Ligand binder design. Structure first.
Ligand SMILES: Nc1ncnc2c1ncn2[C@@H]1O[C@H](COP(=O)(O)OP(=O)(O)OP(=O)(O)O)[C@@H](O)[C@H]1O
Ligand SMILES: Nc1ncnc2c1ncn2[C@@H]1O[C@H](COP(=O)(O)OP(=O)(O)OP(=O)(O)O)[C@@H](O)[C@H]1O
Ligand SMILES: Nc1ncnc2c1ncn2[C@@H]1O[C@H](COP(=O)(O)OP(=O)(O)O)[C@@H](O)[C@H]1O
Lengths: 281, 1206, 182, 242
């Protein structure tokens, strides 16, 4: 980012090429979820409909702005002063104020922003086509990446509501137990949901029991979040509470997990290790 | 000197201190400042001769007794007797607390305590002193417990203290199901709220197994070391928080809300009290709805210091912040600065500098080298010396969401307020109000509000914070007490034994809480969110149903008033169930709160719900209802809420202030009545700061003069606001909300109202029979009151199938919904235009049958004429705003979906056809006047050469001037709209025209000026009437450009709200006399461009709701050829040899003009626009060439023509 | 629109201007009695006598309240494209400003191809014709350089016939002071 | 008239009535100043040679003309007031020497300028290096808001490297002197710029100066494509599945 103040000793054509690449990589359309009165009783369907709506509206806005960029770069349209400032920001590598429509790491590159936008839009397309093919029932069965959702806090709330409706239980008698299974495609319980996209920090998982590691991070396999009835069970001394931050800067929290100390080590060692759970690196 | 003698004239203004010192005998004038002067003091108790201060009166009716009352006569110095009043107030607080702790020694040393003796103690002693005595008793018995332990490990005294607190709380839980006054009930609430916290402390100590007197496991809790034998009154009570050794400030708190000692507040008190011992400051940050400033308030209450939160959310006062600081330092006070980061740069840096100076001046006490034997503490507040008290504190609260100020990152020990224990707060409030199962229902209700704020669709009028939870729990406690009273009365009337505990055991608490939640929040919910929220609430509260509070009496009164007011009705879920539920919710909120918001958009029925509620309550309770629809944007701020003369002081009465003065005086005696004041039009936060004190707990109209106007429950201030998009959060939280969704004022509702009002309203009667509705009710024997009324009823019966649910009009309206018009579409506008057209159709039948006195027209002619007029009217009402292309396509859609016969010409637009006085069709071209203008003036036609468009437009201007409706004429500039307005308006002799153009900076001071010049004021027995000076002469005020005046700072323009109130009410509230008037002989009409054009502000739906709209396009080919053929035929008479060239001249001219306009369009260059104005400039040029010339050949004529074209 | 503005002449202004308008009416020689017809006569005199013309910048303004000035004004005002000076007008304004100086020297030779922008140049060119053609081509190349710089996206500005007249004055003045230096 | 900021947008109506006189320094202006202050301080013989051939204009013209007024013309009107000592031949030879001097300088007007041009051909990589150094060290603003510098400051860097450098004492050979000048320029610039930066950015600024010397040096490729792919490979599209 050094060379864009006075090192002028041709950005339109390069911006045209990268905008053509952006149009190539971003998917064209995001179809909205069809709403029925039977499906609207499912909070999973409610949350997924809201996310599909927000993602498709943002998709339409970004496709329209990209179309404006490519039409101006093709010599068919003209961009005004504020859009010239937008061009300056896109050249200099700063995400403008008209794109922070969800939760994202602060001060990151626009190309990676568009790349993870493409990934999450592909995830939304997958879940939308699964919903269209099967209904609200398959919304529980389909594994959903936690970090790729716009609001995974509302996702875990939605799974809470789904098990509450399924077992006709109040939302003060439910608690979350974390089951990181190395097995892929495990038989999901009616209270258990499949979540990928997690990665552990400062620790490694071994049969739902942590151990200290000198590595930077570990690749967490298919996680299962299970809502079991909160009994009055005494908490063990070998149980450790870890945050699940969304990103690396770790400014906002998603939810808390409970894992098990395996060997002699103090959970104070985990705490001073700063063992966290990240959704994005 | 005045500060040194009495430091309490300082938070209130210089004029206030001047009237205080000049009106020393005006105790009623002086008692106005106590509400903001003290923590909870409202006034003072004085003698009949005002010679002895008997006590102090609170806001909630508490009257504290004085064990040594002050006498004012022997101390004539004002500041001296005031200082003696507060000093003896401290002394009496200390002595009453001494007696109260003496008796609560026996209270706490007894295993069983008589509930009646307990209630007697509560009633005798004040709220502050009773909670302080509970504190002192518990802390002293646990001090005796620990000193008797002495390291021996004896758990018996701690167990006995815990059992004592448990049995006392059992007494509270058994006596809480009674009925009490508000003051005694609040004392009970505060006592149980603190005693459950002391229970928590004792459970914590017995779980920790502490056995030491000076152990920190006990030093980290709320300690009250009391010494009744102390000589000094302030040092009798000591509040010691770990290291800190403070003393309670014995000032009368009054009835102030006590906030619960949660662990977060416990850490907050820990940090701030340790900071104060260290002589630093405190500065908690965090988001909203967490408890920062009220936790500061709770600490200030529990220590006993004057807490006055200085909020500065765009409401700062830079000249008074320094006075705030000097007052804090001089008296000893705790000032929380809620949301300090929302301050602008220069004054933020200035106030940061002053607070830094104050913090360092406080820090001068921290070191031990600066001895307290000789301590002249000094500080600067804008070049002055101020001594800082050793007990004041400044708490600069921050609200990130930004960090601490640069000068304040080191002097203020900051704390993080992020997430309060809402489960704990719900549990303690349920247990304190009297709920037997507090914890389970609390832990159900706390995920509920976060769940709502997550799952519900985001809107501004929603709220789910902890203040909202507190108000919902207050409502739940009140409903629980009411249900207890009802069950007790029912068991008393029936034959059965009465036992409050037995009936409370078998009593549905989940039903009470779900009912209170629904009654507080459901009326603010849009119809989109209702079934999802019921499924949400059934998930959180399984098996718990919500029963609607049924009022069959008000249901019957509502049904009678609705049948009286030409409406429909429904008993729930029917056609009318939604509106009935909405108006009943309006009744519930008017009973609960003293003023609410109706926040439906335009076309909702909020005012009709309001009026039908007023009349139904009239017929129910016999309480006479008064309506004052004061419009806030109809007069400026000073005229609305009164103003002062800068010299020779006289309070001239504004509108709202005059209404409030009249109702407080109540010469007619309106306290027995029910007066309702409605602020129609949307909400603007520039006339709410005066309403805040009126609507708050003070209920006073504060004035600079000093006159206080109370608010009885006779006054209810409702609002009819279109949207709260520009409303403050204070107004969001203060008043209840009944959101009128647009799908409750249905098309069937609109149809039925039109049909019934037509069937039973006489049309030409006017002002005589409007006031004769008081005389008689039905007029039996007058079925044919007029032949036009027989026609109205017959036409309504004929058109009944066309105003159905799935009717032709409904389909046409929903198609015009998905069509496009330049102005902002409104369903009520389309329907109102259609109804006015049907009214004029009836008027046409009436005039035809009056001009045919031999016979009126038969049923067949009636049916054909009204059906054809109905198709004509729906076309001109729906597609009448749009351009010709989609106006024609809506004509085609009407043709393809209609059942009425239509003109047989396929390639001719249906809109180009006139309905005859007979039952058949006839084009306007058959009867267009083919005039021949004089050659004296042809290029500037003061009269229009008639064409298809001109005759259609003049006919419908007549139609919508007859019913005196306003009319707007939108379209591209130069389309002859002002000309057709002038021609059709001056053609009829019944009305005059006063042509006025609104500029961008117009105010209806101009309209009042033109009413003063062109009319006069006449007084009638029926009211006040504004009428033109010339008798029997209607006055149609004219508007060249309605769109042109600029919007206000919040997107609502005065000039259009004025005409809105004219067409809605029929009058305005005056400014000089502040009286209601009625427009008897006035109309309105205006012209516009489309709002996409640059200087054209789009109009409000509030005004566009009424006015019908017509699109004046460019005349088109046949119209242009006709009018300019007439122009040139009557123009070429200057030369007699060229009579046969006018038609080729016009044909060539208009063909060249049309092709030039089709080629050159404004999308390339902004100035490529063409209109018949330049065509008449062309004709003027040809005439100016041909006039001074005797003769000219055809070649010269074409040369002049082409020269002018070039 | 109406030869008048509703709101200018209300109050004592109405009385004073109506008495003066009646005085002018008897001065010119037509009889008017009623105030409405006198007001109409004053309106007719205004709509005959007064004409207002505009002097404003071309179609690049987007900042004033006018900015892209209202289509109502564009319709109600007769429009005339003042435009920019053409090469022929440039040749004339270059020819009859530099003729005062002693530019005459008959040793000039004509080439086989003479680069000329003023398409009706007198062939064979003289000293004056070559001078004026070069002066015009200087302005033409400044336009071309401005267009190139604006296409590349740099900071540009409009060049004017005022600039060109300044250039011609500069050339004649500089020739004058250098011949005066000799 | 004057202004302060260099980035304005004057309206066309004002623009027609006033012309612009720009003082701002761009790459060509900075390079011209660099040549100016390197051709007048480094080699004093080159300085005097360039100053000798640059004085054939109005200075020498007026110095000739002031007494050419009397020297040009001699025809008439004897008066007998010149043979006081017959020393006017020395008076006119005082200008004959100057006439011979200016004629010799007119005859020899290309060899000295050719030597100056061949010296300045070696100074072209130096001047483009100096320009890139200043433009990067002024473009330092995008790293941190404290990273703001002055063209006067850069001119002081250049002035100290040329004049007040003890490393230039007693050195005469010119290729070595050029290497000394460019190395000492880079050294003093890096030192005085990194006196006021964080440790996290000294490495960045050093890498930028090193890339500037790599692209301004001769005898080796500038590694432009390698540098560009190395740096901007993170910002260009990277294909998935590869
Ligand atoms: N009970 C009812 N049945 C049928 N129509 C009704 C009923 N109550 C109201 N309306 C309709 O409401 C229309 C006007 O109501 P109202 O003025 O209260 O609505 P609004 O658009 O919210 O206006 P505002 O807030 O300006 O008063 C009437 O013209 C009528 O057609
Ligand atoms: N169809 C028409 N017939 C006769 N005159 C016309 C017609 N259309 C335009 N004119 C001319 O238009 C001029 C007046 O314009 P118009 O009647 O549209 O009023 P306006 O006040 O200028 O309109 P706007 O609402 O655009 O401000 C007159 O000179 C009149 O001759
Ligand atoms: N311990 C508590 N007991 C009762 N109410 C609380 C408690 N903590 C927070 N609240 C509620 O949270 C809200 C926070 O608002 P407030 O403290 O006035 O300003 P802020 O939102 O800036 O903290 C309060 O209105 C209060 O009713």
């Amino acid at each position: 980012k050094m060379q864009m103040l006075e090192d002028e000793d041709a950005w339109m054509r390069t911006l045209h090429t990268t905008a053509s690449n952006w149009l190539h990589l971003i998917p064209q359309t995001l179809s909205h979820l069809k709403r029925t009165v039977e499906n609207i009783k499912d909070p999973l369907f409610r949350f997924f409909e809201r996310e599909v709506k927000m993602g498709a509206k943002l998709l339409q806005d970004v496709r329209q702005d990209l179309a404006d960029v490519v039409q101006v770069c093709e010599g068919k349209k003209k961009q005004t002063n504020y859009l010239r400032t937008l061009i300056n920001e896109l050249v200099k590598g700063i995400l403008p104020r008209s794109w922070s429509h969800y939760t994202v790491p602060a001060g990151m590159t626009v190309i990676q922003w568009v790349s993870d936008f493409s990934e999450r839009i592909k995830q939304l397309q997958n879940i939308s086509l699964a919903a269209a093919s099967g209904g609200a029932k398959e919304l529980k069965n389909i594994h959903v990446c936690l970090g790729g959702l716009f609001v995974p806090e509302a996702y875990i709330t939605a799974t809470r509501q789904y098990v509450a409706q399924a077992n006709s239980w109040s939302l003060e008698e439910l608690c979350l137990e974390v089951n990181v299974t190395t097995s892929q495609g495990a038989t999901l319980d009616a209270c258990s949901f499949g979540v990928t996209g997690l990665k552990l920090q400062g620790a490694t998982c071994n049969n739902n029991k942590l151990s200290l590691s000198n590595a930077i991070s570990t690749a967490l396999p298919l996680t299962q979040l299970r809502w079991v009835k909160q009994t009055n069970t005494e908490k063990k001394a070998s149980v450790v509470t870890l945050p699940v931050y969304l990103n690396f800067t770790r400014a906002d929290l998603i939810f808390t997990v409970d894992f098990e100390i395996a060997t002699k080590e103090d959970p104070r060692s985990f705490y001073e290790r700063g063992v966290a759970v990240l959704c994005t690196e | 000197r005045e500060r040194s003698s009495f430091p309490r004239f300082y938070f209130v203004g210089d004029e206030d201190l001047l009237e205080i010192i000049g009106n020393s005998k005006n105790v009623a004038k002086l008692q106005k400042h106590f509400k903001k002067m003290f923590a909870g003091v409202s006034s003072i108790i004085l003698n009949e001769d005002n010679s002895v201060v008997l006590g102090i009166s609170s806001r909630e009716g508490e009257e504290v007794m004085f064990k040594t009352p002050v006498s004012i006569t022997e101390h004539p110095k004002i500041n001296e007797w005031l200082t003696l009043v507060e000093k003896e107030m401290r002394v009496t607080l200390a002595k009453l607390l001494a007696e109260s702790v003496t008796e609560v020694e026996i209270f706490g040393k007894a295993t069983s305590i008589d509930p009646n003796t307990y209630i007697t103690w509560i009633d005798k002693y004040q709220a502050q002193l009773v909670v302080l005595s509970a504190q002192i008793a518990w802390s002293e018995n646990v001090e005796t417990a620990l000193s008797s332990m002495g390291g021996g490990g004896d758990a018996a005294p701690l167990h006995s203290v815990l059992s004592n607190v448990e049995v006392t709380l059992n007494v509270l839980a058994d006596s809480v199901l009674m009925e009490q006054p508000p003051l005694r009930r609040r004392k009970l609430e505060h006592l149980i709220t603190e005693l459950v916290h002391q229970r928590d402390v004792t459970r914590s100590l017995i779980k920790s197994k502490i056995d030491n007197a000076k152990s920190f496991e006990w030093l980290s809790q709320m300690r009250f070391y009391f010494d009744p034998k102390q000589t000094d009154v302030l040092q009798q009570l000591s509040i010691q928080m770990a290291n800190a050794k403070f003393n309670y400030g014995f000032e009368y708190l009054g009835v102030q809300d006590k906030l619960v000692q949660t662990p977060l507040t416990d850490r907050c008190y820990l940090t701030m009290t340790q900071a104060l011992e260290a002589r630093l400051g405190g500065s908690p940050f965090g988001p909203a709805g967490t408890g920062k400033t009220e936790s500061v308030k709770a600490l200030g209450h529990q220590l006993g210091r004057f807490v006055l939160v200085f909020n500065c959310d765009e409401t700062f006062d830079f000249q008074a912040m320094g006075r705030i600081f000097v007052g804090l330092c001089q008296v000893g006070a705790w000032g929380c600065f809620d949301e300090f980061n929302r301050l602008e740069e220069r004054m933020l840096s200035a106030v940061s500098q002053q607070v830094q100076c104050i913090q360092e001046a406080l820090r001068e006490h921290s070191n031990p080298n600066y001895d307290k034997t000789s301590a002249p503490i000094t500080c600067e507040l804008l070049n002055k010396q101020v001594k800082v008290s050793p007990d004041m504190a400044i708490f600069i609260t921050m609200n990130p969401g930004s960090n601490l100020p640069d000068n304040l990152k080191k002097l203020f020990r900051s704390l993080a307020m992020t997430k309060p224990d809402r489960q704990l707060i719900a549990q303690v409030m349920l247990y304190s109000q009297g709920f037997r199962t507090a914890e389970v229902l609390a832990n159900k209700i706390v995920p509920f509000f976060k769940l709502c704020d997550e799952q519900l669709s985001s809107q501004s009028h929603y709220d789910f914070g902890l203040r909202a939870l507190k108000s919902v729990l207050v409502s739940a406690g009140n409903v629980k007490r009411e249900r207890i009273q009802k069950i007790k009365r029912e068991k008393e009337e029936r034959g059965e034994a009465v036992d409050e505990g037995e009936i409370a055991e078998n009593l549905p608490e989940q039903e009470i809480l779900i009912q209170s939640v629904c009654e507080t929040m459901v009326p603010k919910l849009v119809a989109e969110d209702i079934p999802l929220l019921f499924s949400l609430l059934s998930d959180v509260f399984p098996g718990v149903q919500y029963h609607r509070g049924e009022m069959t009496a008000l249901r019957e009164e509502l049904k009678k008033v609705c049948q009286e007011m030409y409406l429909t009705y429904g008993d729930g879920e029917e056609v009318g169930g939604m509106w009935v539920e909405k108006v009943l919710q309006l009744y519930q909120i008017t009973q609960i709160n003293h003023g609410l918001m109706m926040v439906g958009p335009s076309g909702s029925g909020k005012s009709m719900a309001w009026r039908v509620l007023l009349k139904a309550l009239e017929r129910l309770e016999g309480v006479e209802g008064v309506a004052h629809i004061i419009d806030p944007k109809a007069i400026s701020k000073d005229h609305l809420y009164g103003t002062l003369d800068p010299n020779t002081r006289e309070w001239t009465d504004g509108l709202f202030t005059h209404v409030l003065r009249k109702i407080i005086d109540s010469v007619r005696g309106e306290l027995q009545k029910r007066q309702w004041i409605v602020f129609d039009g949307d909400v603007d936060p520039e006339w709410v700061e005066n309403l805040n004190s009126v609507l708050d707990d003070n209920k006073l109209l504060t004035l600079p003069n000093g006159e206080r106007l109370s608010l009885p429950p006779n006054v209810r201030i409702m609002f009819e606001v279109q949207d709260l998009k520009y409303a403050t959060l204070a107004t969001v939280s203060r008043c209840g909300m009944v959101w009128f969704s647009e799908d409750v004022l249905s098309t069937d509702m609109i149809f039925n109202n039109f049909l019934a009002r037509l069937r039973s309203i006489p049309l030409d009667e006017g002002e005589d029979e409007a006031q004769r509705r008081r005389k008689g009710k039905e007029d039996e024997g007058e079925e044919a009151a007029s032949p036009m009324l027989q026609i109205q009823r017959d036409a309504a019966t004929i058109m009944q199938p066309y105003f159905t649910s799935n009717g032709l009009v409904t389909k046409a309206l929903e198609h015009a919904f998905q069509l496009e018009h330049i102005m902002d579409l409104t369903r009520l506008r389309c329907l109102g235009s259609l109804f006015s057209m049907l009214h004029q159709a009836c008027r046409n039948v009436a005039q035809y049958n009056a001009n045919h006195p031999d016979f009126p027209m038969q049923i067949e002619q009636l049916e054909r004429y009204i059906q054809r007029y109905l198709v004509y009217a729906i076309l001109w009402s729906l597609s009448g705003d749009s351009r010709l292309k989609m106006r024609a396509e809506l004509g085609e859609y009407i043709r393809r979906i209609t059942t009425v016969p239509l003109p047989t010409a396929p390639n001719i637009p249906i809109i180009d056809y006139e309905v005859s006085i007979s039952g058949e069709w006839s084009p306007w071209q058959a009867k267009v006047p083919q005039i021949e203008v004089e050659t004296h003036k042809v290029a500037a036609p003061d009269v229009v050469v008639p064409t298809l468009d001109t005759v259609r437009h003049e006919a419908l201007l007549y139609t919508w001037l007859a019913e005196h409706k306003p009319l707007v004429l939108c379209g591209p500039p130069g389309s002859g709209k002002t000309m057709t307005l002038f021609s059709a308006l001056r053609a009829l002799p019944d009305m005059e025209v006063v042509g006025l153009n609104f500029s961008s900076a117009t105010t209806p001071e101009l309209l009042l000026k033109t009413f003063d010049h062109y009319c006069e004021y006449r007084r009638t027995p029926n009211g006040v009437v504004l009428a033109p000076v010339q008798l029997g002469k209607w006055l149609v005020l004219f508007c060249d450009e309605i769109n042109l005046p600029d919007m206000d700072k919040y997107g609502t323009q005065r000039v259009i709200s004025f005409i809105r109130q004219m067409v809605e009410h029929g009058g305005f509230y005056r400014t000089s006399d502040q009286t209601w008037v009625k427009l008897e002989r006035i109309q309105f009409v205006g012209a516009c461009n489309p709002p996409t054009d640059p200087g054209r502000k789009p109009l409000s739906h509030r005004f566009l709701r009424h006015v019908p709209v017509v699109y004046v396009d460019y005349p088109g080919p046949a119209s242009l050829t006709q009018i300019y053929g007439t122009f040139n035929r009557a123009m070429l008479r200057l030369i007699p040899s060229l009579r046969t060239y006018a038609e080729p001249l016009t044909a060539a001219m208009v063909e060249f003009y049309t092709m030039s306009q089709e080629r050159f369009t404004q999308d390339t260059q902004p100035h490529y626009i063409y209109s018949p104005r330049e065509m008449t400039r062309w004709v003027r040029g040809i005439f100016e060439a041909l006039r001074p010339l005797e003769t000219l050949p055809v070649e010269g004529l074409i040369r002049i023509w082409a020269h002018e074209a070039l | 629109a109406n030869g008048e503005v509703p709101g200018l002449f209300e109050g004592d202004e109405y009385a004073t201007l109506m008495t003066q308008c009646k005085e002018g009416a008897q001065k010119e020689g037509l009889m008017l009695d009623s105030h409405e017809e006198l007001y109409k006569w004053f309106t007719s005199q205004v709509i005959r006598n007064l004409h207002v013309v505009f002097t404003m910048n071309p179609s690049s303004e987007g900042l004033k309240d006018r900015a892209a000035t209202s289509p109502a004004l564009f319709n109600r005002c007769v429009l005339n494209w003042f435009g920019d000076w053409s090469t022929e007008a440039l040749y004339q304004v270059g020819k009859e400003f530099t003729s005062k100086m002693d530019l005459e020297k008959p040793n000039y030779i004509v080439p086989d191809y003479m680069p000329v922008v003023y398409d009706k140049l007198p062939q064979p060119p003289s000293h004056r014709e070559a001078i004026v053609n070069s002066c015009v081509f200087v302005h033409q190349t400044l336009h071309q350089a401005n267009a190139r710089l604006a296409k590349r996206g740099g900071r540009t500005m409009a060049i004017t016939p005022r600039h060109y007249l300044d250039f011609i004055n500069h050339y004649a003045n500089l020739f004058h002071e250098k011949r005066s230096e000799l | 008239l004057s202004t302060r900021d260099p980035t304005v947008e004057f309206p066309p109506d004002l623009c027609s009535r006033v012309t612009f006189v720009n003082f701002t320094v761009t790459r060509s202006s900075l390079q011209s100043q660099c040549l100016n202050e390197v051709l007048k301080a480094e080699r004093p013989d080159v300085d005097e040679k360039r100053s000798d051939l640059l004085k054939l204009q109005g200075e020498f013209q007026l110095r000739l003309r002031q007494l050419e007024k009397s020297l040009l013309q001699a025809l008439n009107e004897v008066k007998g007031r010149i043979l006081d000592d017959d020393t006017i031949i020395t008076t006119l030879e005082n200008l004959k020497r100057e006439a011979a001097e200016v004629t010799r300088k007119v005859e020899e007007t290309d060899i000295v300028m050719q030597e100056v041009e061949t010296v300045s051909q070696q100074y072209l990589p130096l001047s483009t290096a100096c320009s890139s150094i200043y433009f990067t060290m002024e473009s330092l603003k995008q790293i941190h808001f404290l990273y703001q510098y002055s063209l006067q400051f850069f001119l002081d860097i250049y002035h100290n490297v040329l004049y007040e450098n003890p490393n230039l004492k007693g050195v005469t050979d010119h290729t070595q002197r050029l290497s000394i000048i460019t190395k000492d320029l880079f050294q003093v610039a890096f030192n005085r710029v990194a006196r006021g930066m964080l440790h996290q950015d000294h490495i960045t600024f050093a890498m930028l100066l090193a890339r500037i010397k790599l692209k301004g040096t001769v005898g080796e490729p500038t590694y432009d494509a390698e540098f560009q792919h190395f740096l901007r490979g993170n910002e260009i599209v990277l294909s998935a599945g590869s």
